[PDB]
Assembly symmetry: C3
Homo-oligomer: 450 residues x 3
Amino acid sequence: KALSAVILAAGKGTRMYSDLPKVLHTIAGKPMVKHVIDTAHQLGSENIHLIYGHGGDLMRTHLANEQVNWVLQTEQLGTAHAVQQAAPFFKDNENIVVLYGDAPLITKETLEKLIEAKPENGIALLTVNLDNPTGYGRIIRENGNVVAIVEQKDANAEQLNIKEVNTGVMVSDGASFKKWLARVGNNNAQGEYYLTDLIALANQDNCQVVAVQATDVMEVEGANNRLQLAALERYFQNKQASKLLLEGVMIYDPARFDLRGTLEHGKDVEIDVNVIIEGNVKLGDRVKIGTGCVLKNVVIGNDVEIKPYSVLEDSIVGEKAAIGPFSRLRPGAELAAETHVGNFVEIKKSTVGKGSKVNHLTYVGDSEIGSNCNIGAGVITCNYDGANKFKTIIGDDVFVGSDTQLVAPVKVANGATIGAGTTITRDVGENELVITRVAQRHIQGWQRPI
Amino acid sequence: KALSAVILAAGKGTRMYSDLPKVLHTIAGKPMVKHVIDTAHQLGSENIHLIYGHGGDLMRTHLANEQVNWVLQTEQLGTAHAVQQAAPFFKDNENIVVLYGDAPLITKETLEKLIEAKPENGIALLTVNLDNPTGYGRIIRENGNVVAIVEQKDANAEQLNIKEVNTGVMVSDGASFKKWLARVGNNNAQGEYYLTDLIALANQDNCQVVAVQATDVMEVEGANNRLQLAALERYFQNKQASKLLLEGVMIYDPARFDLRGTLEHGKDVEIDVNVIIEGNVKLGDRVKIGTGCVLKNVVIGNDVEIKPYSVLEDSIVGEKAAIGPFSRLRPGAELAAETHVGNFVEIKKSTVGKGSKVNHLTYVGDSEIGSNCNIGAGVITCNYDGANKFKTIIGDDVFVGSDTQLVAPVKVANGATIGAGTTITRDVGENELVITRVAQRHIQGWQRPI
Amino acid sequence: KALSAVILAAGKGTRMYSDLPKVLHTIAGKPMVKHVIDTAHQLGSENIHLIYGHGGDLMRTHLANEQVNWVLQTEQLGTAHAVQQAAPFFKDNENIVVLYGDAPLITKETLEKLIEAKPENGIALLTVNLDNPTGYGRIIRENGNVVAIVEQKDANAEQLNIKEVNTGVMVSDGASFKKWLARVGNNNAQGEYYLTDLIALANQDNCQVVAVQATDVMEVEGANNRLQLAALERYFQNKQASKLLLEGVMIYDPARFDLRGTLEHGKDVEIDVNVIIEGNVKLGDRVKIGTGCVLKNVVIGNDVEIKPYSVLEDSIVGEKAAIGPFSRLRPGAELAAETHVGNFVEIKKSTVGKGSKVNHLTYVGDSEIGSNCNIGAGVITCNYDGANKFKTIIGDDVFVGSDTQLVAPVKVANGATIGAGTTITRDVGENELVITRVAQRHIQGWQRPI
Ligand SMILES: COc1cc2nc(N3CCc4c(ccn(CC5CC5)c4=O)C3)[nH]c(=O)c2cc1OCC1C=C1
Ligand SMILES: COc1cc2nc(N3CCc4c(ccn(CC5CC5)c4=O)C3)[nH]c(=O)c2cc1OCC1C=C1
Ligand SMILES: COc1cc2nc(N3CCc4c(ccn(CC5CC5)c4=O)C3)[nH]c(=O)c2cc1OCC1C=C1
């Protein structure tokens, strides 16, 4: 049967001490609430009702493209009142799962077990075992069913030893939600309408509530401050790393590895310590990434080595290329197979053809470079003091001598040779040699200070 | 009532295998003994008696500016003998707290509880609970008072199960210290005068000794070798990070963060992995620090992003500036609001005005640069082969073409334009364009090797 | 008496998902099997029989220089069958220790205790205690001898509570091995000849099997996938770091330190976070290594500071030199005492004499530089577009002005001075000053865009 989700996302998150609302804070580069939306989506949710409030304008801008129903709650009167705002949109004969935008690590697999266990006209409640369950509502089981959730203050001596606890995550059908939400009261110390009370109300109707234990506590742990958020971060990164290691990626130290997006990999990939992978990255077979590298939105071909302290963004690198150390590839850098990019080199929005080398102290911007070129140390593409930034075109088999400026727009044809220290402003023809004629003054017997 | 401190700092620290004395080894960039002096100071100590011995000359040079009474002990005959060297300086009616220069993590808050609990004419003894208390003197309580400290070898079966242990840290009034120290003997296996024996001597006088438990074991743990020192370091750094996280600083991974000094911060500051903050650093609102950065003695304005692998020292950066990646700011670098400093750029003792950009492969030293300037890739300020290093002055709205050397002393006035590849030795006037006239030899049909 | 080793190394290692065989995967830069060969060697092994199979060609190329007997097993019929392939080479009156190429952390010290405990004509079995011993053969002791190894499935209730477990590591004399291996059968659920069965067979002969507990579990843990391999890596690195710390090396954070080879050190060496030491490295007294540095096959003299993000390979650095930050030393870099190498500088196969400085944005390759030289920012050694790469020779007390290209082959004699922006192609004589005569066009009243 069909399924929809409700995600609670209205919290201010005061203890974050932030201008952002609570659920927009990120884990692995992605807002907490986005993790939960994505999980709801892969679970098969037909609709996702996003209950929001605080920082409303920011929620809308940061999540503009999310396929969710925006339910703006105007007052915080408890979670049952919050969920009830979405209730008119529930189909009677679909399941509804309730999730929390500040508990981002809840998994599809746990939620599939929760939904599968839901008895008809009843509730499936996600629970978890804690070593120190102080403060949290204890799960009371009679037979295989939950008959109550007794809070800390009400529990007797024996009930306090119960380790099983309420997570707030639950699944019931839409008609049942509409019915029971209307019957929730606010007669308690906080004066709030608690979603917790649905368990009691279901039992009032002789409906079955069954418990399903989450396997990992961190799946149901929320973050109320940045300390707790960093704990979720580290747990998540460790889990991502472990998956990659079991898939055959050699991560030298999983505690010093960060993935903030998606990684596609081949076999025998090696990733040294303190590497960050961001956005969508694809690594081919036998790619080796040295320490300190940052790769954001890149495709790296088979047999590429990236040496330490290289930073790459929005770039493509062909097979058997060698990059680094201290290389920077900026958006639009496209390196062909068997290229070489070296230390203190910056490449921006340029193509570099097969076998070409750019190995030191060089800036190449807005350029096309052909195959088997030799770009000397200190070479710089530049522009006139004008308006827009023009293109430098270098053909195949060109030698550009060290410390030469190429002044765009300019074209250097196949097989040209340019001497060191040259300023190139005019087009260079095929097989043309250009050498700078220097004038020097030589003074003999010039004694330097002793 | 008044308070003074005695700090024991005379140890050689043989197992450090160092030419430094034990207590000069650092935690978070600061000598262990300095942590303890600082704590004594914020506790309200009127005097701080520093008992020193081994590496005396080094202690004096490294701690020359500390407001302490230098008590040089000439022979090591135990801690009671050590403290007695300072005793003539104790005021009869002040409290005296005894602390250890090799146990740097003791806190003001723990010591305030210790002092508050001290009964008049008695002692307050700081104790701690250990899971494995083997080797340490057990605390024996009769009623709410300490009647003995029984060492490992003397304890019976039941006394060995006591987890509460002596830390050596204690508070009593000055007259009591002078009295009891004079009565300590050296009749034991080590032949030493132990400060421990004051507890027995107080009980001999029908004076009350009360125990106060330290909350954290690491507060009273000393470091005898560099392995133990690194454990204290990691604990301290984790504690600093946690405080910052609870204050609203987003530290992506607190295990990969080091603060070696003080940090002042605004709201919504983000600090990526492997950042080191040294000396006194001030970060404004919404500052983002990328991975690998080192900031020492810097002020960073609101909305600055520092990209990966940037190293900054003794520098100021205005709001909305963009630094990095691979940028180096050396002492005296002052960047105005909305500036841009890029990869493989070094700025030393120079001011850079609002909106100006220095984005690649450049050295700017001893310079003043105005607003809205464009400093091209490969630009270098340099000097003649002479004596001292002179200044380059660049005005507002100046364009300096790529790979130009500016030869100090020289002035470039407002609105000037300098072509690429220029050597500037003479002053450039307002709205003056300077272009290098190059001579080139062009040889057609020059075939390069196949 | 004599000793030889047998090392089992034939596994495919399917769950590594690799083109490499299992035991060639590295820990601290060295194949797992190599760790075990090295341990066997320092134990005093006369012969080392290496049982190999899967990835045979790769084993032979990667371990070509290992002093081992290559025993190629053609079918996998169990470990007893494997060891029996080597048995014809066992001397009757030598001890034989059996080790595993996928359990690299086994130590010499543990193995010496194992061998010492071996009763004559009997077996010494290495065992270990586990908290959860499920799946592993339990050690059954009657008196001080092992009478059986009962597998999980056969054990009764009380035997499952035994925490002591079989590691597979054992020592017996050669004649005993030849005898008992011939009597091992394959009547079990897997149809394999298990080396485990020797314990039963020894007991059949009224021969004594004695247990020896390994002190650390990680010594006998094998790695079947890259997750488990990373755990061994981290344990090994922590152990190496701890040893260095106890020897007096200040490693600021042992969890962010990697040694992949050997380290020789003096006193008062400091190593900041995220440093990697590879190959054979020697550091003198008071060497300070900043964060992010990579040192591979280097000798560093007394009192050298290496500042952050410096990468050094196959290089020598004299006392009191200063390197970094952002310095790169490539193979053959030899820096004399009191030299200075700075940011965005690359030195390859060059010698730099005492007191000389190369402090910014410079490439020096295939060069000899003398004492007290000043190599300006932007200086580049380069070659003509020819065949091989020639040498630049610079004498003592030479000043090379900024952004000068030195075009090899060329010689600059003692005391020469070269102006900024020069192209040097011809030899410069002693005390010769060379200055570039520039031609410039100056255009007054050139208004740039507003
Ligand atoms: C960010 O928005 C909200 C997230 C919210 N998240 C939760 N939960 C996630 C965190 C959490 C919950 C229950 C138990 N635990 C402890 C874990 C051991 C079991 C949690 O961490 C329930 N519970 C809430 O009541 C809630 C309200 C929120 O506010 C909106 C709704 C109107 C109130
Ligand atoms: C560096 O100088 C000294 C530091 C010293 N520090 C200490 N303590 C700090 C370390 C420490 C102490 C007591 C217990 N513990 C274990 C912890 C569980 C409780 C300590 O780590 C006492 N105890 C000393 O006797 C001492 C002597 C020292 O030498 C000078 C004084 C003349 C002897
Ligand atoms: C890589 O090659 C092999 C390594 C092999 N390594 C082992 N061991 C190392 C790993 C390991 C063993 C025993 C117990 N444990 C668990 C630890 C708690 C005690 C191990 O991890 C024995 N045991 C094997 O049977 C074996 C076979 C191997 O295959 C070759 C031989 C023909 C089969």
